[PDB]
Amino acid sequence: TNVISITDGQIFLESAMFNSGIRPAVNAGISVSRVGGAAQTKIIKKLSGGIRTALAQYRELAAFAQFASDLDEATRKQLEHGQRVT
Amino acid sequence: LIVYDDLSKQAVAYRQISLLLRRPPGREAYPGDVFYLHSRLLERASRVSEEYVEKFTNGAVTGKTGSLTALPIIETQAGDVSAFVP
Amino acid sequence: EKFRDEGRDVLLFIDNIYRYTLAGTEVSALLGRMPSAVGYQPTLAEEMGVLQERITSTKKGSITSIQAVYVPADDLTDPSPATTFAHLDATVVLSRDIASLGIYPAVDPLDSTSRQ
Amino acid sequence: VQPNMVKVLADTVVRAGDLDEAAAQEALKAAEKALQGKGAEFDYSAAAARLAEAAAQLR
Amino acid sequence: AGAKEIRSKIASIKSTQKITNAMEKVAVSKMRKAQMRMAAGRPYAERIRQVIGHLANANPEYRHPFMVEYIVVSSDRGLCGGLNINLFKSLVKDMSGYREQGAEIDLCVIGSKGASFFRSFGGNVVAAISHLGEEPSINDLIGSVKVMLDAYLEGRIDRLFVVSNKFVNTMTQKPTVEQLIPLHHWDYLYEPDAKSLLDGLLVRYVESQVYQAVVENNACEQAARMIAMKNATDNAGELISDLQLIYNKARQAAITQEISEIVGGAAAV
């Protein structure tokens, strides 16, 4: 808590994601960078915005995904895209 | 066979003497040698070989093994076995 | 270390690494030093490092160590287990359930792990 | 009955005009509904979706 | 406050986890009792279907009103893993369809959870039965079934269906709607007239289908209860694990604070 009060953002690595095969186990849900938004190049800045939302749309459906194949086309496409971005 | 009805009360009496002698306190205010207090006592309860008895009695007793069995008693507080003396 | 210097690979067995930590706590209290978190000695990480850093593989030979570990109050976050786990390379877990089936050795292939 | 098979389709209770009618009347009487309503039930989605989301989180 | 309150919460949740683990095996046991009762009632219904087929084909002189152009089953108790909700969700689709056609709807209720649903949204119930045992008797269904049969003979109902869950497998309960009323070289020695016989057998057939629907729904209920108590046992395990981590933090902090007060007091004396 003291170091979080000094630094300009934190990359959280999660034990559950690492033991699940996702080796670069960055926890997007809570990892943040305060000054870095102004630091990205134009190509990475424009393409990254569409990708962070895809992982957020997956965050709410990931556990439930096994019984989500019979839902509406919107929920199914958001989940299918979320699995590919993950 | 020996019964020590309360080793926890022996530890409390030794803690009192140690604090009154101004010796440095540790966890639960017990002195640094409270483990050695009970260990020095309990390692005497043992079974000794025939050679030990023959050597000790200068050959007066032969072909027999002697022993001291101990049944120490300790009182816990609300089932907490993780306390220092227990 | 003498056997290692003869050009050999050696096994060092430590009956219990928790008792090594406790003996350090007892000596630190006898010397009057100010206690640290959870009542351990202030030198806890240095006393563990001085012992564990000699156990290594060198240009002449090596010392490999098997150390029995006791966990206080079943709390893996306690300073003694936490300081010890920073030096370990593998964890072998023995299961009472596997021994009941007649299998020996009673290692649990799911709970046991290695950095290798 | 058939030359190679005999089937008896029995009844668990003794049917009869009074027993047959009484149970039907008792099933009307048991549906003692002060206010019947209309049946429009426009809250369908608001109730179905609430329980669909709640039932998913539990497993 | 500290470690003492957390230790009491852990013991409380652990005591609850032990019974939900036992209730899963009790639900499996009762599921098997319901499955044997489902099989025991099949021979009677298939034979009544075989008699009505010949007794109608061979007698073109008479057509019963049931041969020319909802009863809802629900539980009486808690711990159902979406069983009743998935059934009402499936029913509302067909009731809405009948209102697109502009047709009026009559409803019959079996079980306490079904009565509460229609009462919370204003549904018109014509008949209702409740508080039946886990092993029901066909004589209790006669009343609710007759009111629905009479409404057909009075011309108030064009089609009648039974709404209930079907046992696909021990891990899958399917909500369904089944039509009830609208269904070779020798002839029988009809003792009474063949018309009198057809009138009685069609009534026995519909009651038997409702009884089979009720017994299969009870098998689906015990299977749903098994999953719900398995989930409750697993959910309690996650809460126990989190509380144990919070307890260990409080255990370590209490020892550190006591040692700080003893060292602080002995530095002054």
Next chain:
Amino acid sequence: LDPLVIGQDHYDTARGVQYVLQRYKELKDIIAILGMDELSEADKLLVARARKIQRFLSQPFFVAEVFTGSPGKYVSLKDTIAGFKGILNGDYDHLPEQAFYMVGGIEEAVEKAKK
């Protein structure tokens, strides 16, 4: 937060919001083990309003625009009281729970529900 300082309408709206959020906090352990479906018909309605109130309290700021991209919102006291009073009265029971998240004034929750 006193009737003699802010008036009865504001005071009762604030007290109503706190009562709903307090009752929702008491049900958290029951909902975690058995789920929402076991609650009474009264508790189910209160939990649904508590979830909407909790989301309507959120607001995009003009200094937070760099973090996400969304434009900031300034909401007057009049608009604040009107939104929470309507949710407490049940005037928005039909709108979806995600329509209240990050929308400034109550009218924007009605437009967000159209998607």
